[PDB]
mmCIF file with all atom_site columns, C-alpha atoms (C1' of nucleotides) in Angstrom:
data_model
loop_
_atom_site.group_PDB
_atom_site.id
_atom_site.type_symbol
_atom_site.label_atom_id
_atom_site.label_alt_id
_atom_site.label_comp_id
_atom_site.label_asym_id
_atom_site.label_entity_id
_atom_site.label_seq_id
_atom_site.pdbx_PDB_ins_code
_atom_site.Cartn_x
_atom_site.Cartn_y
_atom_site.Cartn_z
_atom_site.occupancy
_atom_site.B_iso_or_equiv
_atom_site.pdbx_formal_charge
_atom_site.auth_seq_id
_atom_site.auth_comp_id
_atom_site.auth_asym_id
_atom_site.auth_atom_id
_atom_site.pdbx_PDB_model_num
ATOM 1   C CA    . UNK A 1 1  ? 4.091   -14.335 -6.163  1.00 0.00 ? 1  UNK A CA    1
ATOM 2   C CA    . UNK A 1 2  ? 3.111   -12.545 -2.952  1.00 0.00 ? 2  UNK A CA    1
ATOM 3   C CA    . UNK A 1 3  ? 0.499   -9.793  -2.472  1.00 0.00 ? 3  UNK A CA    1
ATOM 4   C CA    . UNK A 1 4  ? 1.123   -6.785  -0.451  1.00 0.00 ? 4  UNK A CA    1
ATOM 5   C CA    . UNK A 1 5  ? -1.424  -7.417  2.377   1.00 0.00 ? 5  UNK A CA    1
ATOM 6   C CA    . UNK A 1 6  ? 0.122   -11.507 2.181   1.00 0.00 ? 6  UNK A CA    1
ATOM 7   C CA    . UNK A 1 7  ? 3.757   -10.242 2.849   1.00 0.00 ? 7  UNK A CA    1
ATOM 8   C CA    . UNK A 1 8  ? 2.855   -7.520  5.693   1.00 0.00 ? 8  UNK A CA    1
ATOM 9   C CA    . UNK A 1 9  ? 0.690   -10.124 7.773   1.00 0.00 ? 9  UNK A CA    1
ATOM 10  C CA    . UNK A 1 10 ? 4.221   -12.439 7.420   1.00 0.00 ? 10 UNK A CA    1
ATOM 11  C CA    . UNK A 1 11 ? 6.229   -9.588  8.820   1.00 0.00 ? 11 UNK A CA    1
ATOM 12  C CA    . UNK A 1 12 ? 3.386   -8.920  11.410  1.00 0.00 ? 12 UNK A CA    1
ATOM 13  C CA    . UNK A 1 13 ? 3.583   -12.317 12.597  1.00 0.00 ? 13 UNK A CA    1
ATOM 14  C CA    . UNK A 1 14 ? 6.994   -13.072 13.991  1.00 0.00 ? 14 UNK A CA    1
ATOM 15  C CA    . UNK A 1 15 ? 8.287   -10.576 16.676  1.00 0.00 ? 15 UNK A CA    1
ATOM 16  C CA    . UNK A 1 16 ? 11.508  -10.564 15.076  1.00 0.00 ? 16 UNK A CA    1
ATOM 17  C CA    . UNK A 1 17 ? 10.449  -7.379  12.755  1.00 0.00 ? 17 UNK A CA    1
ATOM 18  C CA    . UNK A 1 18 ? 8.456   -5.628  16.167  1.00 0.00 ? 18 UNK A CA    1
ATOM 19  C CA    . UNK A 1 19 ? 11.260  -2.809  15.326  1.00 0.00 ? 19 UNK A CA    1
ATOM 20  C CA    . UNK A 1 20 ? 9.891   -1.818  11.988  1.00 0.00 ? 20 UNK A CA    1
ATOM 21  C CA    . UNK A 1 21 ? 6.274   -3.278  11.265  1.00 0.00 ? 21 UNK A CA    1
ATOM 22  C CA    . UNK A 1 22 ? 4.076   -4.204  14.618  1.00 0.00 ? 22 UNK A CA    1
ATOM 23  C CA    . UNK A 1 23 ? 0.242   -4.909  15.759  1.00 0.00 ? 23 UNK A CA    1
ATOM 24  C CA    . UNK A 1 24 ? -1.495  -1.942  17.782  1.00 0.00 ? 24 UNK A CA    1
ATOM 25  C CA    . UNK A 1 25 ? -3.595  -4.619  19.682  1.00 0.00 ? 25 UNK A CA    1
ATOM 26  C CA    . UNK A 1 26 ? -6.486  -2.666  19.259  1.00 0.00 ? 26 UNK A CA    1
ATOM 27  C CA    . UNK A 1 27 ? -7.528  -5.303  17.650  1.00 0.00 ? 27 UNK A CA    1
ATOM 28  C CA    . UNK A 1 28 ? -6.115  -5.752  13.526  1.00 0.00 ? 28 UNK A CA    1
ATOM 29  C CA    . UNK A 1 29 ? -4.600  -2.315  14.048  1.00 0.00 ? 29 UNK A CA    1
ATOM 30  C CA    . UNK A 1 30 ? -0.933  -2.004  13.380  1.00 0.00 ? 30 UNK A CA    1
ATOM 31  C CA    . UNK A 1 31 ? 1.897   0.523   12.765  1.00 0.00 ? 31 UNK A CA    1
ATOM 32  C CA    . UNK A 1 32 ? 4.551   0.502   10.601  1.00 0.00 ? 32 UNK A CA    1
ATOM 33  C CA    . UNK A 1 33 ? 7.221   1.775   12.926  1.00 0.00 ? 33 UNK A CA    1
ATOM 34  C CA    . UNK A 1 34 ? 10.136  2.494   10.733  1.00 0.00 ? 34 UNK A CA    1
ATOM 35  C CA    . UNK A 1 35 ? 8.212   2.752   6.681   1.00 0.00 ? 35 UNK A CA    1
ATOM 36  C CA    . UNK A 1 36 ? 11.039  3.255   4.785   1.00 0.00 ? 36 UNK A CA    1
ATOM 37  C CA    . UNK A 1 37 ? 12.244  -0.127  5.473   1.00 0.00 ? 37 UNK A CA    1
ATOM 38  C CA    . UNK A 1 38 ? 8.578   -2.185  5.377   1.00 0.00 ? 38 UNK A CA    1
ATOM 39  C CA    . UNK A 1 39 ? 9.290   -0.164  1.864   1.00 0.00 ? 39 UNK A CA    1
ATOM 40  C CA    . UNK A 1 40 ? 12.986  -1.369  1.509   1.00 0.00 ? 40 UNK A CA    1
ATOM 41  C CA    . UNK A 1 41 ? 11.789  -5.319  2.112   1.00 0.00 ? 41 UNK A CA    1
ATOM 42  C CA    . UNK A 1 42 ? 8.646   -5.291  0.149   1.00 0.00 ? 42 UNK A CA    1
ATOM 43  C CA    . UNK A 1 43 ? 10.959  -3.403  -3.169  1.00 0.00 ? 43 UNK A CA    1
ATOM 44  C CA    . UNK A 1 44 ? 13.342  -6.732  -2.298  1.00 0.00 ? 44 UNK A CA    1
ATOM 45  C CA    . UNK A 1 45 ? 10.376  -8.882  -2.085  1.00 0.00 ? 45 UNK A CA    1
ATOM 46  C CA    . UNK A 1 46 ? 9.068   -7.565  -5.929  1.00 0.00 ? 46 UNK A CA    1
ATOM 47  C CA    . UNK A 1 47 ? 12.683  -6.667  -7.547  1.00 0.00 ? 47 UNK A CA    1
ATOM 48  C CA    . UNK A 1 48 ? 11.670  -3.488  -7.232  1.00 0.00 ? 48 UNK A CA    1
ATOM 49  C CA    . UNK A 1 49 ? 14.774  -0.958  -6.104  1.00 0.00 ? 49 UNK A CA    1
ATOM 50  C CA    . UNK A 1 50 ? 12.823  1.673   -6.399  1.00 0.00 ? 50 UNK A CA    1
ATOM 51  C CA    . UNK A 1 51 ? 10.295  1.299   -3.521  1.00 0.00 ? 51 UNK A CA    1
ATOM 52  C CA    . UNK A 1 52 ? 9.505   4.029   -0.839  1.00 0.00 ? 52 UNK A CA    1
ATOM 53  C CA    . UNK A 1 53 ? 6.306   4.309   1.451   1.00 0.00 ? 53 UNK A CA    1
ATOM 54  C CA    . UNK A 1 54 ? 4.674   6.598   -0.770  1.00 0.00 ? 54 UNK A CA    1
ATOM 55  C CA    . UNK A 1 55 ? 4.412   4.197   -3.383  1.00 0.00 ? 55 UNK A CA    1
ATOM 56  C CA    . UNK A 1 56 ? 3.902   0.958   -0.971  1.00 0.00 ? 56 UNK A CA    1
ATOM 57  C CA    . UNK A 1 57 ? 0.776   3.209   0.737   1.00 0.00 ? 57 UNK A CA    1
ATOM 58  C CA    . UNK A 1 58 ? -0.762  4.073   -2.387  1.00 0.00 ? 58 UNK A CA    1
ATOM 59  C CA    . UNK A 1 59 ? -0.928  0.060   -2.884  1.00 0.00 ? 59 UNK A CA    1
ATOM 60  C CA    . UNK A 1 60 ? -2.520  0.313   0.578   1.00 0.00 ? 60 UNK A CA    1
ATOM 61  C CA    . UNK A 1 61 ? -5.096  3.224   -0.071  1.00 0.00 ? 61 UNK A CA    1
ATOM 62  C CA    . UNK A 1 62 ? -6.156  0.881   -3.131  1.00 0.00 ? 62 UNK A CA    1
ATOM 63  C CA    . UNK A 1 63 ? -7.109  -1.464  -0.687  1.00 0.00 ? 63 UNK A CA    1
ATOM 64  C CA    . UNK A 1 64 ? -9.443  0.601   0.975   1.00 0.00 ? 64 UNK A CA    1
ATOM 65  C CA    . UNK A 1 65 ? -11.323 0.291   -2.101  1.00 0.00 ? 65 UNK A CA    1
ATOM 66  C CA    . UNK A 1 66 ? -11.149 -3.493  -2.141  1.00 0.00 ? 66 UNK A CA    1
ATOM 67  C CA    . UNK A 1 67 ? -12.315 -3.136  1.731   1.00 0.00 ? 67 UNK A CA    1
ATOM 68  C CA    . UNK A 1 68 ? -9.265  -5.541  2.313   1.00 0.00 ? 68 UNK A CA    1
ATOM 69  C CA    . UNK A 1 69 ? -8.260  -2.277  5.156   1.00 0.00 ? 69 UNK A CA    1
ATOM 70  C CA    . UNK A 1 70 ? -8.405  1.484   6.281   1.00 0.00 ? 70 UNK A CA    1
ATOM 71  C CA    . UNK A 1 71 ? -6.445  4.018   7.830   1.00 0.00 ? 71 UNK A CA    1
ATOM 72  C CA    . UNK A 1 72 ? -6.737  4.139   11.204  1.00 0.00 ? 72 UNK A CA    1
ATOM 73  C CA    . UNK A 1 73 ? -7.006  7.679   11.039  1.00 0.00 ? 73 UNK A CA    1
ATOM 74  C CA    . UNK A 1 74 ? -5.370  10.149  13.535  1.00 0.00 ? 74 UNK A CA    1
ATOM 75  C CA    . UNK A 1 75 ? -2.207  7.896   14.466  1.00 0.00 ? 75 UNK A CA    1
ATOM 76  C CA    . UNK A 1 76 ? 0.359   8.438   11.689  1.00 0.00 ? 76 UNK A CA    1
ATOM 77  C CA    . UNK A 1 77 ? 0.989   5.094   9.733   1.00 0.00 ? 77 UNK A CA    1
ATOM 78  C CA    . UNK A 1 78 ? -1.347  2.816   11.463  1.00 0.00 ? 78 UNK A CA    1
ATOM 79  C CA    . UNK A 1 79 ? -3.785  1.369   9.415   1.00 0.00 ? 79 UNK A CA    1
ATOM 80  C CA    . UNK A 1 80 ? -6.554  -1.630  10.285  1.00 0.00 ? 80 UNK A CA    1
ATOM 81  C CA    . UNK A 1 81 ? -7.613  -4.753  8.348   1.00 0.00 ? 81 UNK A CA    1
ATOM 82  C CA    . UNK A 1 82 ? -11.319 -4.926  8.059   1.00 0.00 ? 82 UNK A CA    1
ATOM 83  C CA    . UNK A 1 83 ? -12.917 -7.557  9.334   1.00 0.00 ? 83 UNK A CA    1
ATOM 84  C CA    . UNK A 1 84 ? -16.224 -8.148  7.877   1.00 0.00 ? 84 UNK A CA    1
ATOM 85  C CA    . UNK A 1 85 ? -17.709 -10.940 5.086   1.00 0.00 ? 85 UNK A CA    1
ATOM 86  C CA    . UNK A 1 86 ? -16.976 -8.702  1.891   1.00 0.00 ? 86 UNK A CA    1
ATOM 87  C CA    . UNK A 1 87 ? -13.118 -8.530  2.951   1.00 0.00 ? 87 UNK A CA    1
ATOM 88  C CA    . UNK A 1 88 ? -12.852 -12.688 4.010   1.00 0.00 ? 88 UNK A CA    1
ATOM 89  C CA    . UNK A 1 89 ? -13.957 -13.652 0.718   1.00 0.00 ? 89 UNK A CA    1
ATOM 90  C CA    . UNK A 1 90 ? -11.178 -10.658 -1.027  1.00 0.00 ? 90 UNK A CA    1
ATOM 91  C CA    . UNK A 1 91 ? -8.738  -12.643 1.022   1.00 0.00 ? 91 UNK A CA    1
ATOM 92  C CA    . UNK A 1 92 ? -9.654  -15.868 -0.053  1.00 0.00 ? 92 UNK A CA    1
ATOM 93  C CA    . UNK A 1 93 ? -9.036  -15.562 -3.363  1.00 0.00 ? 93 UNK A CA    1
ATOM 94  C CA    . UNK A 1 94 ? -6.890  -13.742 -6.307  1.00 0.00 ? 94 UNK A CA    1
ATOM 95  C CA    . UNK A 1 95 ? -7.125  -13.584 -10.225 1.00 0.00 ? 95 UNK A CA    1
ATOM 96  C "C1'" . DA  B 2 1  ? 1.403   12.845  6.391   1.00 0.00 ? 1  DA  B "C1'" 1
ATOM 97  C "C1'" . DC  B 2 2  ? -2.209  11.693  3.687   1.00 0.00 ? 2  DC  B "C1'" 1
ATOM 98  C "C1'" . DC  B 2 3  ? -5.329  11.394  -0.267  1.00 0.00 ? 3  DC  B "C1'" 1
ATOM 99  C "C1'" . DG  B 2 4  ? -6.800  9.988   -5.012  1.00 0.00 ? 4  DG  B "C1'" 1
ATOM 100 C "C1'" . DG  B 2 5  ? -6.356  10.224  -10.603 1.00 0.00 ? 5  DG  B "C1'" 1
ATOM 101 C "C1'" . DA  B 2 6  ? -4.600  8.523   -14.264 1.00 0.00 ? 6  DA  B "C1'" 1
ATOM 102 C "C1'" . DA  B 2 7  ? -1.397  5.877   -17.192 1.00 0.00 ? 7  DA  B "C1'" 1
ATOM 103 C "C1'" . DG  B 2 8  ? 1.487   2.000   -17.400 1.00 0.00 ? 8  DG  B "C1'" 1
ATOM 104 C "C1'" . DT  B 2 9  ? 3.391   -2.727  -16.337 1.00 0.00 ? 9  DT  B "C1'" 1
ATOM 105 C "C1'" . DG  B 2 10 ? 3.702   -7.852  -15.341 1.00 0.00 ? 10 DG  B "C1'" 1
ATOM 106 C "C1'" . DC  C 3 1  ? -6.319  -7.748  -11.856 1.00 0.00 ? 1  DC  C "C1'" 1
ATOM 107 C "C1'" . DA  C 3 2  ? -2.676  -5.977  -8.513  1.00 0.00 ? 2  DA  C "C1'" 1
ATOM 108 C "C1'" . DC  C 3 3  ? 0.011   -3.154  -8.058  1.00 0.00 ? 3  DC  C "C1'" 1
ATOM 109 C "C1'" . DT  C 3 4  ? 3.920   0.825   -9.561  1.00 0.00 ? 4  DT  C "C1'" 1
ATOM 110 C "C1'" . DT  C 3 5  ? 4.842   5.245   -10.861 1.00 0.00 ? 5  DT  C "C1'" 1
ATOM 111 C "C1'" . DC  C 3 6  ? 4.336   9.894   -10.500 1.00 0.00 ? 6  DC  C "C1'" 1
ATOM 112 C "C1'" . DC  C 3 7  ? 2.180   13.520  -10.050 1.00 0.00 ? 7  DC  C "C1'" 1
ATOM 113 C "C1'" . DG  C 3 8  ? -1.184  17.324  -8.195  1.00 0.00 ? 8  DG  C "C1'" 1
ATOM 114 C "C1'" . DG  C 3 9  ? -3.745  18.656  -4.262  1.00 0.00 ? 9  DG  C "C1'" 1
ATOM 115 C "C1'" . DT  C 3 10 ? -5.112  19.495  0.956   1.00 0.00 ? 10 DT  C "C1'" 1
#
DNA sequence: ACCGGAAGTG
DNA sequence: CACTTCCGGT
């Protein structure tokens, strides 16, 4: 019962995974190095065979709706969390 | 590579 | 709600 945001900042975490999914350091900047397999892990993650990173970043382009995170336009699969009030209290809480 | 829209699924 | 699917479009 894991949301997609949830299970990347577990991978994130642990340098154990810094071959695939990694923080920039510019601050909550990070890169998913290799997609296809933060895609291959998440699809095991929701039974979902059929998961590729087209799919997985349309679930992250909805959260720039939710203001959860952005792109972190210009360098190719890096995206941001954003860190302001309206996105603590998305995180801190679910239906 | 990257962006939605729109329907559909638990 | 929170994605998944699956396009069309730039």
């Amino acid at each position: 019962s894991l949301q997609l945001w949830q299970f990347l900042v577990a991978l994130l975490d642990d340098p154990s995974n810094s071959h695939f999914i990694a923080w920039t350091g510019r601050g909550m900047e990070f890169k998913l190095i290799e997609p296809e397999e933060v895609a291959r892990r998440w699809g095991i993650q929701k039974n979902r065979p059929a998961m590729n990173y087209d799919k997985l970043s349309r679930s992250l382009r909805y959260y720039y709706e939710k203001g959860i995170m952005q792109k972190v336009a210009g360098e190719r699969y890096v995206y941001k969390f954003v860190c302001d009030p309206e996105a603590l209290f998305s995180m801190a809480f679910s239906d």
